[PDB]
Amino acid sequence: GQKVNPVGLRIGVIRDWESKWYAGKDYADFLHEDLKIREYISKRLSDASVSKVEIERAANRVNITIHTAKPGMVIGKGGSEVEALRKALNSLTGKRVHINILEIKRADLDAQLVADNIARQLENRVSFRRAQKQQIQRTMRAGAQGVKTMVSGRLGGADIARSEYYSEGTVPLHTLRADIDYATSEADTTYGKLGVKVWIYRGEVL
RNA sequence: GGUCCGGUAGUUCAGUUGGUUAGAAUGCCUGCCUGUCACGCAGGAGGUCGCGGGUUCGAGUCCCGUCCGGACCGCCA
RNA sequence: GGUACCUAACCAGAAAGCCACGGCUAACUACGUGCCAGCAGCCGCGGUAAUACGUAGGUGGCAAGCGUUGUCCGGAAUUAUUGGGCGUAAAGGGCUCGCAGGCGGUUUCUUAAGUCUGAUGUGAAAGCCCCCGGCUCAACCGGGGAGGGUCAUUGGAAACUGGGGAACUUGAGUGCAGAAGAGGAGAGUGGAAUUCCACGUGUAGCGGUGAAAUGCGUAGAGAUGUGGAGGAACACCAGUGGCGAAGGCGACUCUCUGGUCUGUAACUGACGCUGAGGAGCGAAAGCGUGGGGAGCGAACAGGAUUAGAUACCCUGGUAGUCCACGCCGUAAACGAUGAGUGCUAAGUGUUAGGGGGUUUCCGCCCCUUAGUGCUGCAGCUAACGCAUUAAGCACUCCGCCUGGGGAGUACGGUCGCAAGACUGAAACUCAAAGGAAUUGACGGGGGCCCGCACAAGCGGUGGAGCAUGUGGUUUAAUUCGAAGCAACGCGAAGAACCUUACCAGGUCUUGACAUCCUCUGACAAUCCUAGAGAUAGGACGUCCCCUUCGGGGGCAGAGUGACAGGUGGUGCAUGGUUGUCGUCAGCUCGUGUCGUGAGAUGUUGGGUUAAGUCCCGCAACGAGCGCAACCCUUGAUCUUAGUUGCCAGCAUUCAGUUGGGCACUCUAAGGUGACUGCCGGUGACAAACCGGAGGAAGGUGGGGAUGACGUCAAAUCAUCAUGCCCCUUAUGACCUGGGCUACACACGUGCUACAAUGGACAGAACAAAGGGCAGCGAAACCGCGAGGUUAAGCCAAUCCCACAAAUCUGUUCUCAGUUCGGAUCGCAGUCUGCAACUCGACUGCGUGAAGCUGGAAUCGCUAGUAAUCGCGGAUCAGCAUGCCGCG
C-alpha cells in the first residue's frame, strides 16, 4: 500500500492540466492525438531533454508550448530543425500547428529533468550512491526547500533488489498547499530494470 | 474322539427371552468451531443377523445338520 | 684420473615447472555446472547470473623445485614461577580439632648451613656464538677466543633466611571484676488446641470444591455443655534479634557442661598461623532393634476434571513423622564468597558493653571496643555489583579449575546390612556449550487507555427456491490469475460469434502487425462458382505531388534476408502499481551527553486530548515524516447575476404557458461565518476539562479526499524488461464449430418468499441525482403484451429519458400450504442481433414446487444510521438479484 501521486492529487487546485483545451464530441480523438504528439516530441527530443509540454486548441488549430533551456539551444542551430520537426506534427495532426519554446531557468529544481539526469547517470554505469547524493545537494544549493529522491531495482547486488532513498530538507506531502513537483523515470541496465522517483518542495501557494 | 457354549453395524457388546420392532458405544461422513490440526458442538448412513434345511400367520431370537472357533473330559491296569 | 683446473673453436641453439586467486592471505574475469557434479584447514560454497565446483586467459608466491600427507615446538598467558584463575562463566572441601609438613613479633651478642664474592682444579674433541685465514663469497674447512656446573678444595664478607646465647612485650595465653545469650546433654513440670470416648441437650443434614461428588447422619450426625484418654509443638513476647565452627538451636524449672565480649596490666614471654593424610560432628529422607502413634501423610482406595490424568482438586488412609541406642554420611550443607594477619573516605540504624562531660535524678551528648544490617568514596569488576562484615591494597597455609556431551556413568578398589557414598578413565562425537548486559517479541504477568470489540437493541446469514463466485468431479476443452483475516456478484464497468488464450477440424509462412533492400508504377473495390478461411479465374478491372524529365516525395502491390510473435515460464530477477496491520499513533535523524559495547537520552515522568495534542519538569537542545490544518462537499446569510428558472401583486388561461418583474426559491462566483471567541466553575494562573449564553451551526458541527517507517519473498511477467528455452514448414498466425454456462456433491456472497402490520382491485398523492446525436426519442393510432406504425421537440435549468414506489383513502378476501409463495415446466408471441439448440431478456396462457421463521454456530449497524422503498448510471445493439451513485 503506497502513496497517492502528489501532482496527481494537486492537479486542478494548485496545478493546471497541461492540456488546456475544451472539447465535446471530439474529446476522445483530441486526447488521442495529444498523446500521440506528446509521445513523438518526447521521443525525438529526449536527447535535448524536455520536462513538460502543454497543448492548446483554437479553431481546430493546435498550438504547443515546450519547456527547458536546451530547446533554447534548439532555437538557434535547430531553428531550421524546429520547422523541420513541426512539419511532422503538421503531417500527423492533419491541420497545421504552432509552437513556442519557454526556457526553464534553474533546471536543478524541475522534477522530470532531475529524474532524467539520474536515469542517465545510472545507465552510463555510475553508482547510485554518488549520483543521488550529489544531485540532492545540487538541487538544494540551487535553492529548493526540500528534496526526497528514491531509486529501486537490482541496485548492483544483482541477485536481489531493494529500495533506497536520500533526503535533506522539509517536504510535506500530506499538506494540500505545498508545491511538491513530482516526476519519475525508468532506467534500463544490463543487470535488470531501474526506476527513479524524485520530488522537490519548492514552496507553498497563496 | 466325546459333552457344553456361543458366531450379530467396519470394530466391541446388547436384542439373542418377548416367534409378530434389529439396537448401544466406537469408527466413518457433512457442517460449525480453530490461523491449521486435535478436543469439542450439531446433525447422518449402515448391518437385515456364520452357512444350509425344516415347523409357523410369522423365525434374528424355535428344531435340525454343516463350518468356525472357545470351555470341560479323555481314567483303572 | 688425463678427474679438478687452464687454453681455444662452435650455438640462442639442448635446459621451467609447481601451487593459489571469497576472508583469514598476495593475486579476478569469461564459459559449463544447477544441493548435482563436486570443494575443504576454519568460516563455509554449490538448488541456471558461483571471483569458493571443472575448465580458459591473466594475475600472485616460489623455483629445480613446488604441493599433500605424517611427527615435534610455537602461536597457546590454553597447566601461567618467568606467566592464569575459583560470587553468577570451570573451580572454596559441609564444618571443625589437629600429627607430619610449610610459614615466623622487636632488640642484642655469637655461627656461618643458606647467602654474596676472589683463587685454584676440571666441565674431552667436534657443534651453537665472536674474531680472523682458506676452498673463484659459502655450503664447507681450518686457526684463536668466549660461553657452558643449583661442580670439588680453599680464602674473604655477615646485611638477610637458618643455628646457639641474652633481652623485651604489642602477638598469643593465664589470673581478676563483670555481661549476655533458642549454646549443648539429662530429669521433671504446665497452657490453648486437634482427635477419640462416655454423658446432657439437640433436629436434619454435616463436610467439601471453580461448580460437584466420594464420605459421615434417624443405629440420632454436625452443633453445643461437661468429664476423662492420649500423643505432637511450644501462640504474643519475636526483632534482617541472640548463640553456635557447621548442621542447627525458641514454653517453664532444676542438675551438669562448652564457648564468647567487655575493663584490667598482676602474671608467662613468641608459647603463633595454616594444615595433605587421620579423628570427630554433620538437616531431611533412609535402614536395624524395642516402644509410641494425636494430627499430618509417601504408597494405596474412592469421588471429581480430562480425549486420556498412573497427577493438580476432594474424602479416607499404611509406612514415616515422635522416643532410646546404633548405622548412612549426603543437600542450592549458599554469603553459590576457605582460614589467619595488617592497612585504606564517610553516613546511618541496631545488639552486649566500657569511659567521660551537666546530676552519683531521669535523659541529652562525646569518645570507645566487639558484633549484626543498610547506603556510599577511592579501588576492583566483563556486567551485575562488592566497598573496614571487600569481591580493594598486600603476606603465609590448604582445597579446587583448565571446552560441552559421553558421565559423576563404565571398570577396579575402600566403606555400608542395604539403599548407596568416596576415589574416578576411556572410545566416540560437536564447534560450540556458557556469564552479564542490550534491543524487540511474547506471558493463562502487572498498571493505564482506545475501537459496533464486548455488553445493551434492530435486522440478518445458513432451513427452501433461484442469481452469481469458488472447491471437487467431468470432459476434447471446461483458457488462465486469485486461496484466513487481507481469495471465493474477485481480474470480468457484461462470454451466442466476436471477447477467447483453450479444444476438434480445415489452412499460411519475412508472416495481420514494424524498419531496412530491388522492382511496378499511385493502388484498390464491386459482383460471379466451391466458399469457412482462402484460393481458380474473371467483367472497369492495379488510374498521385514535384520534376532543366535525371530522378526524387508518398502511396500501395510483388520478391527479398536481416527480422516481427510470443495472454509461453519465472511477482523468490524487477520496474510501475495495489491490499494488509491502519487513519492506528507512532517512526526517525542533526548536535550534544552517559556507557566500553550492544546501546540509552531526546521519544521518559503530571495531567491532557483522538492524537509524539499541549503545557510543566527533565542532559538534553532542535529538526524531519506522521496528527492537525491548508482541499472538496452539506449545513445560515450578504453582494452580483435574473434565462431555458421563479411567478409576491395584477389581466388572462387547461398549457404562472403569456403580458410584465427578479419580489421569493433556485442557480454559481466572491465574502461572512465557529475561532475556545466570551461569562462562571474546576484545574497552580499553565495546558486543558465542565456548565452557560449568544448562535444556522460549540468544542476536530457532519461526511469525503489525504494512508508515516515498514511486515507479510502478500498479489500482478495479462502495461514492462536482462534471463533461458518455442520457433518462425511452430507454443507464431487466419477461418468454421464447441467453452469458459458441464453437474453425482461442498462452501462463499446475494435476490425472492414463508403472510392479514398481508394479497388483490380502484382512487389520491409527494419527487432526487444523472443520461440523451449511428442519441434521447413526444403526441396520437395498432396490440389486453412484450412492442410496432408514423414520428413533434431536444445538442439539452427549454425537449425526452421520466406516469419515483413505499405511503394515504376505500371494496373484497377470513387463516389454510391459502387469492401467500412463485420455482420448474408445455403452448403462443415481442425485441435485438446474419445468428437466441448448447447459450439472452421480456411478455400472454396453462401451470403451480419447496417453504408456514430455520440446529451447532455466525454477521452489519451508534440517528437521517440500520430497516425498508424505489430512481438513475459505467460496462453497451441484447444481456444486472452484481457494482457505482441518488433520494
Side-chain angles (χ1 to χ4, degrees):
Chain A
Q2 290 199 41
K3 287 61 169 159
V4 72
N5 183 306
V7 291
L9 193 151
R10 275 148 200 72
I11 283 140
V13 51
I14 312 295
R15 164 66 80 76
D16 314 305
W17 282 259
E18 272 269 357
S19 188
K20 217 177 181 178
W21 44 265
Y22 184 109
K25 189 274 215 175
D26 309 12
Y27 206 71
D29 43 5
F30 272 34
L31 181 59
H32 180 42
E33 74 185 346
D34 179 304
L35 330 171
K36 283 191 291 190
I37 64 99
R38 275 185 209 276
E39 166 47 69
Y40 173 108
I41 68 186
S42 48
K43 166 183 174 68
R44 285 181 76 256
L45 282 283
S46 69
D47 293 303
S49 83
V50 51
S51 41
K52 68 194 204 284
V53 63
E54 173 169 57
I55 302 87
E56 185 96 19
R57 296 288 190 143
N60 307 27
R61 144 74 64 72
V62 172
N63 64 291
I64 312 298
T65 175
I66 197 167
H67 278 92
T68 313
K70 298 294 105 180
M73 72 155 198
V74 179
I75 292 172
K77 181 235 70 160
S80 57
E81 195 276 333
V82 163
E83 181 59 18
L85 74 86
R86 82 104 181 178
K87 223 80 79 166
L89 268 62
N90 290 341
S91 309
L92 294 171
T93 47
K95 185 152 185 178
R96 298 179 178 185
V97 77
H98 158 279
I99 69 100
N100 156 290
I101 288 160
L102 174 57
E103 176 152 77
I104 288 180
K105 173 150 50 62
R106 286 197 268 84
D108 285 307
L109 51 84
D110 183 295
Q112 164 45 269
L113 303 188
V114 173
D116 179 51
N117 246 317
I118 297 299
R120 261 177 286 95
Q121 282 117 39
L122 265 289
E123 291 198 333
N124 319 51
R125 207 170 281 174
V126 182
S127 85
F128 66 70
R129 200 101 61 170
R130 305 284 81 73
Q132 274 247 51
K133 281 298 208 83
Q134 165 276 320
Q135 166 48 45
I136 165 174
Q137 56 75 26
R138 183 146 71 182
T139 292
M140 206 29 51
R141 74 186 56 189
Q145 294 199 252
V147 178
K148 185 156 74 178
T149 83
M150 181 175 337
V151 66
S152 57
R154 284 149 58 111
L155 317 188
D159 271 25
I160 184 160
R162 63 200 206 242
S163 297
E164 172 280 306
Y165 62 90
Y166 314 110
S167 52
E168 81 205 60
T170 165
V171 182
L173 265 51
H174 274 218
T175 198
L176 270 43
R177 184 163 48 222
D179 186 16
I180 313 325
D181 78 324
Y182 183 110
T184 173
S185 74
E186 181 191 312
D188 314 343
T189 185
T190 89
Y191 256 131
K193 185 63 75 72
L194 271 290
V196 173
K197 298 185 157 79
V198 317
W199 46 111
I200 297 96
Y201 184 13
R202 176 156 45 259
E204 72 171 300
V205 185
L206 281 171

